[PDB]
PDB file of C-alpha atoms and ligand atoms in Angstrom:
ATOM      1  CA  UNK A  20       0.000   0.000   0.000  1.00  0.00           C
ATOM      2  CA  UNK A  21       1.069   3.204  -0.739  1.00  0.00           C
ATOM      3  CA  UNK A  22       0.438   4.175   3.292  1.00  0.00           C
ATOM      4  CA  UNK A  23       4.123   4.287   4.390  1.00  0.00           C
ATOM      5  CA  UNK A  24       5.045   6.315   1.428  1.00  0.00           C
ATOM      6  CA  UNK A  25       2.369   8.857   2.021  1.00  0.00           C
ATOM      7  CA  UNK A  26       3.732   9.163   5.727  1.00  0.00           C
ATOM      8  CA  UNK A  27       7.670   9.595   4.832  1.00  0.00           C
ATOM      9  CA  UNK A  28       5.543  12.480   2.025  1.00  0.00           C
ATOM     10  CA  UNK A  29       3.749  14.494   4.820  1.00  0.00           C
ATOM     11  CA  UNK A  30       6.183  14.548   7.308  1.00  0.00           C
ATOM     12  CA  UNK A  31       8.869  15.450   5.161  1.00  0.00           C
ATOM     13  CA  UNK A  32      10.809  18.858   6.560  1.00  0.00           C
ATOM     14  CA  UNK A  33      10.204  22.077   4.270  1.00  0.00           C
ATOM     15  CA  UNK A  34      12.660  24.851   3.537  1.00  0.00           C
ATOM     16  CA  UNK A  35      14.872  25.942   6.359  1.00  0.00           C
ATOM     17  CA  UNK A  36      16.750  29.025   6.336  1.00  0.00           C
ATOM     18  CA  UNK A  37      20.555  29.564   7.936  1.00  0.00           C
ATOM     19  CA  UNK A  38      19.956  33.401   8.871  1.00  0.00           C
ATOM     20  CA  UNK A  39      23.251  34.327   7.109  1.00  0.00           C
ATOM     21  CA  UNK A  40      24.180  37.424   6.676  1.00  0.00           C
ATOM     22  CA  UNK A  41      24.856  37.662   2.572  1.00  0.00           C
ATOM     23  CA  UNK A  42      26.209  41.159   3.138  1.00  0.00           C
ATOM     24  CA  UNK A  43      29.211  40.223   4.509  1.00  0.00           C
ATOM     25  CA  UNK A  44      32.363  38.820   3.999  1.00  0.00           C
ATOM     26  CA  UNK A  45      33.110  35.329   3.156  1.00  0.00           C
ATOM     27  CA  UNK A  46      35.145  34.486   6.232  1.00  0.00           C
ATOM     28  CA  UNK A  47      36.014  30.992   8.144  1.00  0.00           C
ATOM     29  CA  UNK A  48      33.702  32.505  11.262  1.00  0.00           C
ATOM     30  CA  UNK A  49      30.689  34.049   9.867  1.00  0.00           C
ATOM     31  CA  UNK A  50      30.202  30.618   7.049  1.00  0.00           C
ATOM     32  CA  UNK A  51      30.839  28.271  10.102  1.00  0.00           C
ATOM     33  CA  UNK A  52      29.205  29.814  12.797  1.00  0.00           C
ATOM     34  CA  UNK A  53      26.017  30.226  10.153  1.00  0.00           C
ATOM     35  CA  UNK A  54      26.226  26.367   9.404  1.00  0.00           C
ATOM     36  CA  UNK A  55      26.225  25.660  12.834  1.00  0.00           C
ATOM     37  CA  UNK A  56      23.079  28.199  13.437  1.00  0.00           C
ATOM     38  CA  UNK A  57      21.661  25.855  10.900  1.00  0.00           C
ATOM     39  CA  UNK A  58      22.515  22.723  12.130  1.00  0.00           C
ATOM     40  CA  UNK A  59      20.455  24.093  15.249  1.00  0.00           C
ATOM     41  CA  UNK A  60      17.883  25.126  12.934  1.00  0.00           C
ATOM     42  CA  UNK A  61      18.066  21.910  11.044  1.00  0.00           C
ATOM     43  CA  UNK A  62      18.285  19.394  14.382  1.00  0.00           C
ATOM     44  CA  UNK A  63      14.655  20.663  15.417  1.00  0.00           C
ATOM     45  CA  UNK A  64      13.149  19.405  12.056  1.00  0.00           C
ATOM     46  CA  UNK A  65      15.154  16.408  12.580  1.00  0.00           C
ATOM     47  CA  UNK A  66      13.599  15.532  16.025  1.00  0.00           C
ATOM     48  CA  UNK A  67      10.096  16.726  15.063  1.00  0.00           C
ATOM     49  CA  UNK A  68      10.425  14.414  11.763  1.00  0.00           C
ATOM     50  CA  UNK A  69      11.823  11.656  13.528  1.00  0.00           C
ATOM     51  CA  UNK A  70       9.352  11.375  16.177  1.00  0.00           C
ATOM     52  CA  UNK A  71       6.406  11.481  13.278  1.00  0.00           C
ATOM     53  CA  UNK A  72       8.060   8.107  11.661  1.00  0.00           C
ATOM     54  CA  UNK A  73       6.332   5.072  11.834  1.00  0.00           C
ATOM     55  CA  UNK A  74       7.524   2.625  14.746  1.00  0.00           C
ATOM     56  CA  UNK A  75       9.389   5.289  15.955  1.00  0.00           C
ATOM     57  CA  UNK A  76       7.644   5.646  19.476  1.00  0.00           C
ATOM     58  CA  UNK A  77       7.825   1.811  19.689  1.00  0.00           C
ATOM     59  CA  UNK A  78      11.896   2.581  20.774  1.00  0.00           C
ATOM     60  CA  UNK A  79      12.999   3.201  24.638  1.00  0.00           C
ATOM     61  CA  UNK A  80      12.352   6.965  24.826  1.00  0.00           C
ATOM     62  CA  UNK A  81      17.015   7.432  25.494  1.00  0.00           C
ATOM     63  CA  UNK A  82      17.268   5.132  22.252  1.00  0.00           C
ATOM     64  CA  UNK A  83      15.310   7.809  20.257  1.00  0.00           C
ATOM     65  CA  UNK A  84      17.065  10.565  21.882  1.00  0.00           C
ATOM     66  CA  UNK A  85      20.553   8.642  20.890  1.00  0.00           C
ATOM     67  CA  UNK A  86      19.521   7.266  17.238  1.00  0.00           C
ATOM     68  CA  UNK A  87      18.899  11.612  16.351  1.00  0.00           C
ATOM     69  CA  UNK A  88      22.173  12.447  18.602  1.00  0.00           C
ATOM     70  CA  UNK A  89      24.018   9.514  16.260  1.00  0.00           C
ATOM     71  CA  UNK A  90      22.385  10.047  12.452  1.00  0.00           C
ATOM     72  CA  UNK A  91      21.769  13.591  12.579  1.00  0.00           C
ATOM     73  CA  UNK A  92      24.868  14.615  10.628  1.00  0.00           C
ATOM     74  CA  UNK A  93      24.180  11.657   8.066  1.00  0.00           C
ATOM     75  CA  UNK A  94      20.807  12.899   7.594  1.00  0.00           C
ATOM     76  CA  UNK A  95      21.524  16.545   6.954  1.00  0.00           C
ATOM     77  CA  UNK A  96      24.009  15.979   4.617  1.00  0.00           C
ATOM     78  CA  UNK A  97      22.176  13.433   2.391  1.00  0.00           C
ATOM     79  CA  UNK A  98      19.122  15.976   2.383  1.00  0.00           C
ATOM     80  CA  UNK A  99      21.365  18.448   1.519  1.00  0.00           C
ATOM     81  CA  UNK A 100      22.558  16.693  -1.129  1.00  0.00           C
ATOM     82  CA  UNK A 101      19.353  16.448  -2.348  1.00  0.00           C
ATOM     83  CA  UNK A 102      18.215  19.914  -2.199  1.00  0.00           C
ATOM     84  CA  UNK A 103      21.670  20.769  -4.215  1.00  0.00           C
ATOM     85  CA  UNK A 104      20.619  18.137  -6.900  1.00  0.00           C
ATOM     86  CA  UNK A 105      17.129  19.231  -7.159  1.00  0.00           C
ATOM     87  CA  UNK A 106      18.203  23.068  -6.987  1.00  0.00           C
ATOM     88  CA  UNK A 107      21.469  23.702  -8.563  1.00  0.00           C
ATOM     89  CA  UNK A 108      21.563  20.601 -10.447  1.00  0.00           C
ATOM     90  CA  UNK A 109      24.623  19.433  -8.236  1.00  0.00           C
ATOM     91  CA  UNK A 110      26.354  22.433  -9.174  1.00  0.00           C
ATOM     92  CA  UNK A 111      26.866  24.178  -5.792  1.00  0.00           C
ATOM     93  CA  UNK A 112      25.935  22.818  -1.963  1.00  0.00           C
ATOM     94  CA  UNK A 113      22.735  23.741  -1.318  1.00  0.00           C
ATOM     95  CA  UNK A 114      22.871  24.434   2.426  1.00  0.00           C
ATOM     96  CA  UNK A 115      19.676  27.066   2.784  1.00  0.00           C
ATOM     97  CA  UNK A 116      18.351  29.392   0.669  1.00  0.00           C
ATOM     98  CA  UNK A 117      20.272  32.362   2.178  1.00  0.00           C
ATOM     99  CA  UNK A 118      23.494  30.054   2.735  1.00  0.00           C
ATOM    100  CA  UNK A 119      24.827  28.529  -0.870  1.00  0.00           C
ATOM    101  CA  UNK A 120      28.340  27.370  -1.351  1.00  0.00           C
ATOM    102  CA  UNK A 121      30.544  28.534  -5.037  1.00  0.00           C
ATOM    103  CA  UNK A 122      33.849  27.827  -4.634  1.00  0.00           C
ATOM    104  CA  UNK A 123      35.148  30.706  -3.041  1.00  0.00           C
ATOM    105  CA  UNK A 124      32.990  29.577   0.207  1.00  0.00           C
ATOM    106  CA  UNK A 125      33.945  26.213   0.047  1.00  0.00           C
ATOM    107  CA  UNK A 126      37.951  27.351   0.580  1.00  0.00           C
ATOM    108  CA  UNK A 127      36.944  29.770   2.850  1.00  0.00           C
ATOM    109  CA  UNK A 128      34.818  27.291   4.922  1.00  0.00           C
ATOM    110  CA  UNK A 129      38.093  25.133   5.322  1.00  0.00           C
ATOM    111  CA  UNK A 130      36.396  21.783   4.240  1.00  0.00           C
ATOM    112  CA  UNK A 131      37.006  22.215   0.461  1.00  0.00           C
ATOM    113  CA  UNK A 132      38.045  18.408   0.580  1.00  0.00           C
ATOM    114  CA  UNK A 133      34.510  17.299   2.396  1.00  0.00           C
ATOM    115  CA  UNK A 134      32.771  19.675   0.490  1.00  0.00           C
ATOM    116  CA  UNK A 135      33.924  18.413  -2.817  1.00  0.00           C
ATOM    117  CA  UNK A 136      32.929  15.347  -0.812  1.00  0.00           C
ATOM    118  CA  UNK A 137      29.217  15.723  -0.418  1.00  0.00           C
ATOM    119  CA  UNK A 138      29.084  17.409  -4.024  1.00  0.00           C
ATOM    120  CA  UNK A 139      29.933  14.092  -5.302  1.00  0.00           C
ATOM    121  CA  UNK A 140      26.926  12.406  -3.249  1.00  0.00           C
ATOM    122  CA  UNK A 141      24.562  14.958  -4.503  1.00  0.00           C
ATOM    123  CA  UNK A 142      25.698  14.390  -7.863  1.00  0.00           C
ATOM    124  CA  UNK A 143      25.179  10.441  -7.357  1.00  0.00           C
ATOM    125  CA  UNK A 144      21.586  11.268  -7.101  1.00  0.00           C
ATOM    126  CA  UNK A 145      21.371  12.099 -10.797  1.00  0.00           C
ATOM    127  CA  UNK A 146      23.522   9.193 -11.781  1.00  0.00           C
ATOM    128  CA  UNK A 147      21.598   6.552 -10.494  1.00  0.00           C
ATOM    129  CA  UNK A 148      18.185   8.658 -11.198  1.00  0.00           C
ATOM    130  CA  UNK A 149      17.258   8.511  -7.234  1.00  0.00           C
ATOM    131  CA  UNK A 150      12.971   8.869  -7.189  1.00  0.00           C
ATOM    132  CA  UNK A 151      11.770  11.011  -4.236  1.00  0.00           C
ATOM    133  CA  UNK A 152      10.126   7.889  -3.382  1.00  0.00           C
ATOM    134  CA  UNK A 153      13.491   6.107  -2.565  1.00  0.00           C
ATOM    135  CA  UNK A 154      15.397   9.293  -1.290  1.00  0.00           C
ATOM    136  CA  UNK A 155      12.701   9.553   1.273  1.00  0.00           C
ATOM    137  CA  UNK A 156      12.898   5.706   2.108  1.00  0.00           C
ATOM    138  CA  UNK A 157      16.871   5.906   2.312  1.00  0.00           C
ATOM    139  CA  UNK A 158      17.209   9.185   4.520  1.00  0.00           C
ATOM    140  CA  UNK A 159      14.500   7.164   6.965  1.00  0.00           C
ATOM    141  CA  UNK A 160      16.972   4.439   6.946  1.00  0.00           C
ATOM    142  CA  UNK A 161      19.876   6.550   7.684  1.00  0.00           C
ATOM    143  CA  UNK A 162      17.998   7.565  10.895  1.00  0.00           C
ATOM    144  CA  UNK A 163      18.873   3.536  12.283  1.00  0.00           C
ATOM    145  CA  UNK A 164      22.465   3.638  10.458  1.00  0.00           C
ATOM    146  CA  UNK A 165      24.328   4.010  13.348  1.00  0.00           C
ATOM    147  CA  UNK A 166      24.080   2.529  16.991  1.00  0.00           C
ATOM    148  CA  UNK A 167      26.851   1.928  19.710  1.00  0.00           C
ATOM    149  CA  UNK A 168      28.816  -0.970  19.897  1.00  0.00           C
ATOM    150  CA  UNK A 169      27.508  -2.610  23.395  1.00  0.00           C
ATOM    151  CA  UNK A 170      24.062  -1.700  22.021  1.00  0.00           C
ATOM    152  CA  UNK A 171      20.837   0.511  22.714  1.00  0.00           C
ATOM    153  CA  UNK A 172      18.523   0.066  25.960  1.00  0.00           C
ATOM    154  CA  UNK A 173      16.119  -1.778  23.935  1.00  0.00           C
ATOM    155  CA  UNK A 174      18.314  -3.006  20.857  1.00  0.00           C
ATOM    156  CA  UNK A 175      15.743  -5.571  19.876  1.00  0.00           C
ATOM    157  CA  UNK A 176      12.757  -2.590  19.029  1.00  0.00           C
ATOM    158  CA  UNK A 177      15.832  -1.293  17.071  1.00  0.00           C
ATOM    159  CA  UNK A 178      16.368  -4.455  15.332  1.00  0.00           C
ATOM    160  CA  UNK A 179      12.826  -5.155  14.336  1.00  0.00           C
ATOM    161  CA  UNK A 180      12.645  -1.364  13.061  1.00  0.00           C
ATOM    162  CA  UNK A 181      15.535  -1.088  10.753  1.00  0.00           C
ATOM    163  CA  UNK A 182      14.407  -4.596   9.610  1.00  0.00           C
ATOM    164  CA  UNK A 183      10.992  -2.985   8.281  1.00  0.00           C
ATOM    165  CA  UNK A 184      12.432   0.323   6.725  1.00  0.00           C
ATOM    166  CA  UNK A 185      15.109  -2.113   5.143  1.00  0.00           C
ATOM    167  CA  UNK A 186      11.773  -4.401   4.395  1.00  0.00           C
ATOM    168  CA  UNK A 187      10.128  -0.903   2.927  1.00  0.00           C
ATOM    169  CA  UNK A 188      13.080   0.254   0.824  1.00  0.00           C
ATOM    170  CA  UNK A 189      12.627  -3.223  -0.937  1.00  0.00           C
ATOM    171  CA  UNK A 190       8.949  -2.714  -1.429  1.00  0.00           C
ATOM    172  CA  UNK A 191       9.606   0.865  -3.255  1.00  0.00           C
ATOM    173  CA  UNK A 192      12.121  -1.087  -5.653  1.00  0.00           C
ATOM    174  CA  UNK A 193      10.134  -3.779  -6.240  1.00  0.00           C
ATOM    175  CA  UNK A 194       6.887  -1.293  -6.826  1.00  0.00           C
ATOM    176  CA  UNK A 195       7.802  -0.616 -10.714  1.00  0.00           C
ATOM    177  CA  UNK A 196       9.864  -3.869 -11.780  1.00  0.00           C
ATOM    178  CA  UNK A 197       8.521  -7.485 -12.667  1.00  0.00           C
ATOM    179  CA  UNK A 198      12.071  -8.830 -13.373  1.00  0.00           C
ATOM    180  CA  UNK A 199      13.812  -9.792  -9.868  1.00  0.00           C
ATOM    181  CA  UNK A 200      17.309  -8.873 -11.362  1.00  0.00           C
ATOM    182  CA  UNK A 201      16.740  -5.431 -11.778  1.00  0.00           C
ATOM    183  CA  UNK A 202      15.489  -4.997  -8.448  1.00  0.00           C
ATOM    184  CA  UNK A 203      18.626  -6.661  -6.810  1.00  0.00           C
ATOM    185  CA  UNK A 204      20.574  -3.851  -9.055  1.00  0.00           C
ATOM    186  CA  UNK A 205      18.691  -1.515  -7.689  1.00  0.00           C
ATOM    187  CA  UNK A 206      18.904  -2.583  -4.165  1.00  0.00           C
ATOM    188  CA  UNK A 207      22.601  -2.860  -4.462  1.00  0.00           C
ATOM    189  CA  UNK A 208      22.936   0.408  -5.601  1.00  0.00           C
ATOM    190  CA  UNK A 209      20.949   2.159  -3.131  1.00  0.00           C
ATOM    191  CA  UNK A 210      22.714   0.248  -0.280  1.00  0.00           C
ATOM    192  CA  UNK A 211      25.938   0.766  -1.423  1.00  0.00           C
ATOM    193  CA  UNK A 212      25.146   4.874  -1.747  1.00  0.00           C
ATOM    194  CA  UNK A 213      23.646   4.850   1.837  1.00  0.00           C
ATOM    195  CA  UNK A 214      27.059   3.400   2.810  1.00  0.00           C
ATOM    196  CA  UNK A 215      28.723   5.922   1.372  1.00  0.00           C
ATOM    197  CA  UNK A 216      27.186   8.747   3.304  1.00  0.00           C
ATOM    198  CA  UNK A 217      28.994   7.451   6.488  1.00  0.00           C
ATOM    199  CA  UNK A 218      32.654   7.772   5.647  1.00  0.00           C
ATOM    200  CA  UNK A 219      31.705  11.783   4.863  1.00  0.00           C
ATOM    201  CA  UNK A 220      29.627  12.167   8.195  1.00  0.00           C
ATOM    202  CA  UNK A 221      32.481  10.845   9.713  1.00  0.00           C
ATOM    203  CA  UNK A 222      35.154  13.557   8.439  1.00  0.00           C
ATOM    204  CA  UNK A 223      32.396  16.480   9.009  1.00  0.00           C
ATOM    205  CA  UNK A 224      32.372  14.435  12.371  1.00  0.00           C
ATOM    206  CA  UNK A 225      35.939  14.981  13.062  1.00  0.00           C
ATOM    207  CA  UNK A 226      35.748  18.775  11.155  1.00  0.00           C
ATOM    208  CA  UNK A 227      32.859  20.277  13.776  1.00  0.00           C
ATOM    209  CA  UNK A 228      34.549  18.078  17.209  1.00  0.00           C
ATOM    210  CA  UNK A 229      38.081  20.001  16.199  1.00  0.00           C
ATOM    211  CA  UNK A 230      36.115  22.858  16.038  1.00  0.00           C
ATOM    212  CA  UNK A 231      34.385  23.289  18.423  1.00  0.00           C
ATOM    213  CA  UNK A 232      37.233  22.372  20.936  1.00  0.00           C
ATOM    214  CA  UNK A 233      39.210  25.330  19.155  1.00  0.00           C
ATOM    215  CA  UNK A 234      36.041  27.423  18.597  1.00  0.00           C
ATOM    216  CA  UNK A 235      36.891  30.390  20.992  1.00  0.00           C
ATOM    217  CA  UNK A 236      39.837  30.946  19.005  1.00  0.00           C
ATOM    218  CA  UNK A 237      38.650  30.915  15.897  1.00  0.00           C
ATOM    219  CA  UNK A 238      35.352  33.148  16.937  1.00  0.00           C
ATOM    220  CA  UNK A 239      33.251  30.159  15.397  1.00  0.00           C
ATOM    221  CA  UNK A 240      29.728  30.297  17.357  1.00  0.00           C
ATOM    222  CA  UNK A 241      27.833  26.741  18.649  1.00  0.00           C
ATOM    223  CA  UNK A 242      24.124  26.674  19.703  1.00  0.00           C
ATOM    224  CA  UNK A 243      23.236  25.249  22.621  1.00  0.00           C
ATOM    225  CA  UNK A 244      22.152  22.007  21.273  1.00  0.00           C
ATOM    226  CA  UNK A 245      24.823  21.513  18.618  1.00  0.00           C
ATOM    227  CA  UNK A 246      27.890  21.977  21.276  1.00  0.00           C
ATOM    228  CA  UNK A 247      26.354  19.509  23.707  1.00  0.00           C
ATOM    229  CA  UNK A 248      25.668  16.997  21.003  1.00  0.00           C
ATOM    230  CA  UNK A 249      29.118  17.481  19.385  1.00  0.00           C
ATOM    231  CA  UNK A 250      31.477  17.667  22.912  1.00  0.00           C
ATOM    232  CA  UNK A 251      28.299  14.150  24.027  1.00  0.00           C
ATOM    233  CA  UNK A 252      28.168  11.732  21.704  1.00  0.00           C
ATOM    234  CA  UNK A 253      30.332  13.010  18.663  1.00  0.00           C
ATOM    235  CA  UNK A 254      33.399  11.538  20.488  1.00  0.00           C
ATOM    236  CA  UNK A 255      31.877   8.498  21.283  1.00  0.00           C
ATOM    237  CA  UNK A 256      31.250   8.116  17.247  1.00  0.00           C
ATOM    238  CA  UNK A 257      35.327   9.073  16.808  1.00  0.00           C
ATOM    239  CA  UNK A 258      36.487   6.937  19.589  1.00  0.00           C
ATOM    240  CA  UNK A 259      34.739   3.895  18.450  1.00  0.00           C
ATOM    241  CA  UNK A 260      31.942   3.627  20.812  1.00  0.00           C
ATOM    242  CA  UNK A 261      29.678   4.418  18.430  1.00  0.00           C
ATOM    243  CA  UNK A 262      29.821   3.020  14.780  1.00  0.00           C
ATOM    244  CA  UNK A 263      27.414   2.958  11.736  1.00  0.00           C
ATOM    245  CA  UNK A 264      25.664   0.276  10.462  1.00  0.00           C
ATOM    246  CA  UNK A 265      27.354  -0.845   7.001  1.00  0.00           C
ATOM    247  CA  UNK A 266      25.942  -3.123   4.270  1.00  0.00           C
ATOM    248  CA  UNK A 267      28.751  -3.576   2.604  1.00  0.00           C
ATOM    249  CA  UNK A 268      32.208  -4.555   3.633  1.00  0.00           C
TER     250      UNK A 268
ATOM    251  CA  UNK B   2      21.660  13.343  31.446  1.00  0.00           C
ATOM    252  CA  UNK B   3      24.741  14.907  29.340  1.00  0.00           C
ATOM    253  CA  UNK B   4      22.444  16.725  26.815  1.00  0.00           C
ATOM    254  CA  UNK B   5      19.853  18.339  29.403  1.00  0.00           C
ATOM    255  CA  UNK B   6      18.709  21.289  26.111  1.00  0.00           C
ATOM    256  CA  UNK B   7      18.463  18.290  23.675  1.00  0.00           C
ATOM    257  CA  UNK B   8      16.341  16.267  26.345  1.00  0.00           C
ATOM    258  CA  UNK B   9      14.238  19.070  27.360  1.00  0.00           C
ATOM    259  CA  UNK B  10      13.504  19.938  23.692  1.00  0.00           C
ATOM    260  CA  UNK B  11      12.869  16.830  22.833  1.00  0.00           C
ATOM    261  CA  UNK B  12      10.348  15.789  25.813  1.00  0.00           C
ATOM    262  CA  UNK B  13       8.322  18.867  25.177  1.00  0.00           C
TER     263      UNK B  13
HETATM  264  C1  DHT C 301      24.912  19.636   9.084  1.00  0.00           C
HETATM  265  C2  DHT C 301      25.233  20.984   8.316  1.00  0.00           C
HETATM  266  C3  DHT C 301      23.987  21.917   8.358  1.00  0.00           C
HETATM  267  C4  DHT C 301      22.719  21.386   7.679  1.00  0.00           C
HETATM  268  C5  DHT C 301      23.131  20.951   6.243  1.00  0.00           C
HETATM  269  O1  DHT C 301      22.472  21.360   5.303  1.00  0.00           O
HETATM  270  C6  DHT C 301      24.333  20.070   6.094  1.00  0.00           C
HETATM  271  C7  DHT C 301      25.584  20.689   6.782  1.00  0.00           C
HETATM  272  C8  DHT C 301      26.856  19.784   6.649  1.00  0.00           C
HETATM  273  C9  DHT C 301      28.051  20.475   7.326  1.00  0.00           C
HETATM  274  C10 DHT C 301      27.789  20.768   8.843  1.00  0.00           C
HETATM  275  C11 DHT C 301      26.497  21.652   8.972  1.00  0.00           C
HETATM  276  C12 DHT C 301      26.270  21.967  10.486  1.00  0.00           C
HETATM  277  C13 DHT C 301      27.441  22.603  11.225  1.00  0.00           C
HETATM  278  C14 DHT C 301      28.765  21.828  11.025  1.00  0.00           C
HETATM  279  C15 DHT C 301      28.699  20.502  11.889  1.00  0.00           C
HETATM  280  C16 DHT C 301      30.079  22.552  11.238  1.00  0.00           C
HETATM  281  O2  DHT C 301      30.441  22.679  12.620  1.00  0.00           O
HETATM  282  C17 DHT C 301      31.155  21.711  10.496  1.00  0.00           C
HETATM  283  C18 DHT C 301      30.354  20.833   9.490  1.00  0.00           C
HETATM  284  C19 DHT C 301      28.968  21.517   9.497  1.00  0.00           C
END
């Protein structure tokens, strides 16, 4: 039925704006302390979104606290990513409206590297001729991508849940192909791009902990939310506590 | 808890 898809439809976040000041110059603090203001921005979509998903509830109220605290760097980039390819045809990162990346900003920003990075993810969704209907069924996967090592307080609710969006991402596949061979394509090719948003959450991972720990020398603002969340779990994710959930070796 | 703002955000 098409019920899932018309839930992952309606809750889906609209446009979010960064508040950046376009006036001024393109320098290291203002560009990173207005993609942190919209991380903030961002992060309360994210938790109103994620609480809206089906099964969601059915988790130990700390697990869905974690599983946003984990994925929410994952999940912002790959919408981002979309929003660029949808936009800007790829061309330029797509952050907000009022916060769009040429090159200049991308040297400036000091993450040239991951931003070339997450270009070539937004690009992939062109290549591979991603439907809405699967990026919305992959970003809802990337939600349960990424758990710690010892487990979650209720790691079997987890286990059942990412089961039935992995269950759901087959169902979208299978929706417009008879032959079965064309749907394992397909289903190898969307796993293997989910994978690939991890290694790039984990340098932007390692970019924003660095930062903030140096961020009063830099003059590089953090919300409230965003430096708890990056100085909380962010080093769990770096030290190994915390790892993603690959399909792929 | 370690992220009291996150918690009390996300509890209201
Ligand atoms: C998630 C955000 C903000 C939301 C988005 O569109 C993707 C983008 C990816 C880079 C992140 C940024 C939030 C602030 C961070 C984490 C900076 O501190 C360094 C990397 C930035």
């Amino acid at each position: 039925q098409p019920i899932f898809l018309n839930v992952l439809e309606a809750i889906e976040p609209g446009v979010v704006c960064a508040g950046h000041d376009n006036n001024q110059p393109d320098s290291f603090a203002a560009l990173l302390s207005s993609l942190n203001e919209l991380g903030e921005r961002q992060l309360v979509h994210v938790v109103k979104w994620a609480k809206a998903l089906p099964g969601f509830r059915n988790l130990h109220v700390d697990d869905q606290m974690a599983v946003i605290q984990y994925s929410w760097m994952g999940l912002m980039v790959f919408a981002m990513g979309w929003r660029s390819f949808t936009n800007v045809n790829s061309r330029m990162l797509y952050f907000a409206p009022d916060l769009v990346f040429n090159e200049y900003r991308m040297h400036k920003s000091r993450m040239y590297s991951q931003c070339v990075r997450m270009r070539h993810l937004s690009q992939e969704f062109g290549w591979l001729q991603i439907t809405p209907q699967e990026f919305l069924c992959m970003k809802a996967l990337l939600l349960f991508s990424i758990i710690p090592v010892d487990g979650l307080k209720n790691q079997k609710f987890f286990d059942e849940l990412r089961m039935n969006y992995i269950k759901e991402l087959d169902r979208i596949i299978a929706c417009k192909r008879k032959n079965p061979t064309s749907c394992s394509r397909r289903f190898y090719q969307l796993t293997k791009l989910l994978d690939s948003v991890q290694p790039i959450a984990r340098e932007l991972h390692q970019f924003t902990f660095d930062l903030l720990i140096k961020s009063h020398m830099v003059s590089v603002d953090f919300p409230e939310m965003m430096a708890e969340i990056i100085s909380v779990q962010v080093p769990k994710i770096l030290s190994g506590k915390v790892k993603p959930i690959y399909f792929h070796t | 808890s370690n992220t009291p703002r996150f918690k009390e955000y996300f509890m209201q």
